[PDB]
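Usage example:
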Amino acid sequence: RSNGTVSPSAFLEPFSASVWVMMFVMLLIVSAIAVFVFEYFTIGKAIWLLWGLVFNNSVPVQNPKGTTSKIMVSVWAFFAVIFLASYTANLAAFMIQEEFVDQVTGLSDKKFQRPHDYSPPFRFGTVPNGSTERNIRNNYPYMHQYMTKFNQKGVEDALVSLKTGKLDAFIYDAAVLNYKAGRDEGCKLVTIGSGYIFATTGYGIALQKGSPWKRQIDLALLQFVGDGEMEELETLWLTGICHNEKLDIDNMAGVFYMLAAAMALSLITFIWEHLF
Amino acid sequence: RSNGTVSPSAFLEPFSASVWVMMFVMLLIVSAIAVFVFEYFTIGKAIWLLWGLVFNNSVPVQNPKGTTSKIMVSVWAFFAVIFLASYTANLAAFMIQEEFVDQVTGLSDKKFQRPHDYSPPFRFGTVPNGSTERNIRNNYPYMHQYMTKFNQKGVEDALVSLKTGKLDAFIYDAAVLNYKAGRDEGCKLVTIGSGYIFATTGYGIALQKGSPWKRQIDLALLQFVGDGEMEELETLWLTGICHNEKLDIDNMAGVFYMLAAAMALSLITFIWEHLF
Amino acid sequence: YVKPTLSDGTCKEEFTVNGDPVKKVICTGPNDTSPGSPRHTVPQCCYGFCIDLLIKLARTMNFTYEVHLVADGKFGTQERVNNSNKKEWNGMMGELLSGQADMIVAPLTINNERAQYIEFSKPFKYQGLTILVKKEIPRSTLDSFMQPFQSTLWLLVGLSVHVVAVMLYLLDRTLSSAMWFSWGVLLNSGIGEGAPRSFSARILGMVWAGFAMIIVASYTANLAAFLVLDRPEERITGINDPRLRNPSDKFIYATVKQSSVDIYFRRQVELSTMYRHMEKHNYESAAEAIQAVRDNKLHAFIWDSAVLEFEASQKCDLVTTGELFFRSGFGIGMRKDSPWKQNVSLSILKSHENGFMEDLDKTWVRYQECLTFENMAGVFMLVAGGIVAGIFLIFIEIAYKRHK
Amino acid sequence: TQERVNNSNKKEWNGMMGELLSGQADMIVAPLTINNERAQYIEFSKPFKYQGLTILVKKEIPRSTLDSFMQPFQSTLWLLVGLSVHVVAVMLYLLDRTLSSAMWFSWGVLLNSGIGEGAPRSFSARILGMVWAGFAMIIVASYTANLAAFLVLDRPEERITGINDPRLRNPSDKFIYATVKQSSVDIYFRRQVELSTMYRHMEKHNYESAAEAIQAVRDNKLHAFIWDSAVLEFEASQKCDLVTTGELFFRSGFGIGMRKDSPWKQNVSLSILKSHENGFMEDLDKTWVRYQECLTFENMAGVFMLVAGGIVAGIFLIFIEIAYKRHK
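Running the assembly step on the lines above writes:
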């Protein structure tokens, strides 16, 4: 990613649901029942009070009548403050969580077929005379056609160039890339695949074509796997540095658009009322 | 230590030591400046309005007027919002702080200085036939006679009897006892203080006087210290499961005391005003 | 998969999610799944991942399969025969160093104890074994009014404002008006019905309102902190966990009896206690434990990751925690030395590098289906109760006023 | 420690041990770590202390300011919120068409605090005011949540958990940690070859003495230091400006070195034990090594002075108002 990725989660709010709306409906019903009980112009004043006594009380809708009205107002205020405290706690918990899974997570979804039709030449930094290049050539030649554009050097030089210079995407061995991302300075480089692999095939020790060693070596390797050696071997050798260890202006675009739409609807309603 | 958790909170830490005086003087200066601006029971109404704006939106009076007063009110509201946000943030930050009771530190304590007197009948571990008995009998012949008729049978038996409270303390070598208290039933009980050991002597493997092995053996042991043997061995063998692990009533009592003092002061001022 | 056939006998009437024919084969497996019953070789129907792979293999290499399900049901592990002291094979594995046999297409983990008598091919699926644990609905939904904080203490400080009301009486000389104004200032209602004559009384009322506001803010901060820090879920992770390593008499855990995993537990003497503890709680079936976990009898289950991930994905009730350990791969079995070895291994490798295996696995596995509400319901119920009480009180007050 | 002679394959002892071996002394009473390499040809005594290697790092004394505006979250967000509030006020005034006075507190007062000067004309104005109040409450809640999260997230720096932390095992060009040259710590880091990168990094930056290293660390020169537990703990406790990260590793007490062929051994070590149980050593340690120990106005005064600025701005503007009513 070019810079920090932050999700406003405007559509992930519990709004437009049947929980907060249900609680508001129940509170409104209770307030209406209390007003009807205390009753034994007024409807507009009650509606204005209910609208005001929800979020901010800095609006003149005051119309006190008696002790029952005071009691119902106090009950509504207590319910509202409890709901606001719960919502603030939920918002803090949401801010605690982070969502930085990946960017694309796909090898042949839309982009890696013909970049000329998309415009931006995403970096295709493979390496010549290897094992990944032959597979990518034998799978679909279209990607191999553009692979000749960006092919600089081994893992270190290509990673250094892609860090800030000219390259964006890098496709290479999974284990090498996992190690390189584990040992990245500042943890600013992450493989965007959510730990997904394409053509899983293990390594091996290439023996001869009939030498009397294959059976013994294979049995010894399986014995080593069973007895618990390679896990400590990798946790002592193959382990990353951080890897596993883990009021925005742009976040206000959705709520501002909703407020503008509400203002437009209010203006339309005012025009309709003035028509009659 | 399972009788009382004794969890510290914000009320345990000192409050309003000297910063609160600074806040009081700056708010008084601001109120005086606002009153002077207004001048160039109105003063009382303005003071009440400022106090409400500082505390919470309440019923104001018709003190403010003109354009400067509205700007002052808006600035005060913004300052109060910022102050309450900062207070909530500080409370959230301090909520993660915690501690526990410590009682006395080390084997030398005020209660253990003399066996008799005090008030509660103390009962502390006096397991005989070991270093923990000879050390006391040869360097502290005052807490020996009292503990003569209090010896238990075994460490497990002593702990079991301590669960159904009979013994108020236990004394033993702080290498088996440290592990034993770290793997109890939920490790509700723990050591006393920060483990201020009295006579840190050590362990060892005995030998016949003048045996030819001695020298060699010593060298071997030192080598095992170098190649991280003892650390991993102890971590695997004698490390516990919770050794790593480590609406306030006091605040309510303090606020109740403050309210009572304020009410008494108000009554005294009313009596003085009636007299005058 | 295992599915009983219809009255006709031939499998039919099946379509995938996207819409395509589904290959089916006739399984001549036993129906008496109970441990001891008259066997019946009724032709059943079987389909899934391994069947599709076998169909592709038979398309590539010329032969004619005749699938028959195993009789016992156990995977096959070394065990001493009764009334003797020797070792012999059994289960599915025993039916390979045997007659009909001639291949095995099933989940068969690669292990040292099985690689001498027979040999496998290149693995077609890499998968470790993880921990599957039960799940429960969190109780931190703030359903109660003051569940995280101390509700009783709140009632205590409620009496506090009553004392303030008593103080209002001391400031009365209108006492009811002062109490109403204090109550309104408690929640910023702004009733404005209290106008004490003495200036000192007004100052005391303002101080009381400020103290109440401070207390309310502190209570809200405490509840928010309690909600944020509420995380009582801390389950066993890995083998190094002291909780799992320490034997437990409350919650038990085991795996399929005498099937691969136990062999591992018999070759790592460091554990020791876990093997002895689980030796008397193993279930004799694969689905028995997965259906008894929700019955609150086995709090943990050890099994291969491939089955557990799909089980969690389909029934979105349980989760899989921990990290992979003893990483290995599956594989098609074989007997001693047969000419099929090189062709089978080469075909599997070619299919693996062609993306066919990835697409088939995605299609057959990766179709994964998988302001508080309880607090809102509790608040609604409390509001309804308070409204009923207030209506009754208002009716009583109106009746009294009409009579006085 | 032990070094090699110049242009030769022989071994030589320099400093304290070399001085002792060449018939120049008989006792080495001083802080001297017990090591296998040393103990080969010197007869030690029972330890009179217990300690382990420890890391010390400077501590950032200022951790907060309390005078921060909405800038840490976003200032452009505040500007956009103000612009949206102004646009909402303008729209509400347009919907009304009292008069300018109606626009005096149409939305500006409502979004600020309780004024009660609003004069609604149509139900659309009331709906717009309710929407504005809800948006203001939501913005206030978001700002408070951001402040609380920043307070919780505050102080990102944490104590490095010992030497097993990969953040120190992996070398980087941001830490110049080193120890005193030619000490027991160098020997321990030498014949423990699994993290030789740190060994080389220290070998290219090793200092000369504890006092110079501490003085340099004081003026933010070296960002870390590894040394004995007791010495560094005392240095941090007295000079209350540093911390001791980590707990312990490679624990080993001091001792009194003497030559192998000496008659004082069997009478010295025993004595130490006899002086280790009648509280003598604990009393001496209490006397010498362990005897010392160690919502602001910036959130208010820094604002109050700004309020004082209003006292120097509004009053003059009041005269402008007097001018405004002069020609009107």
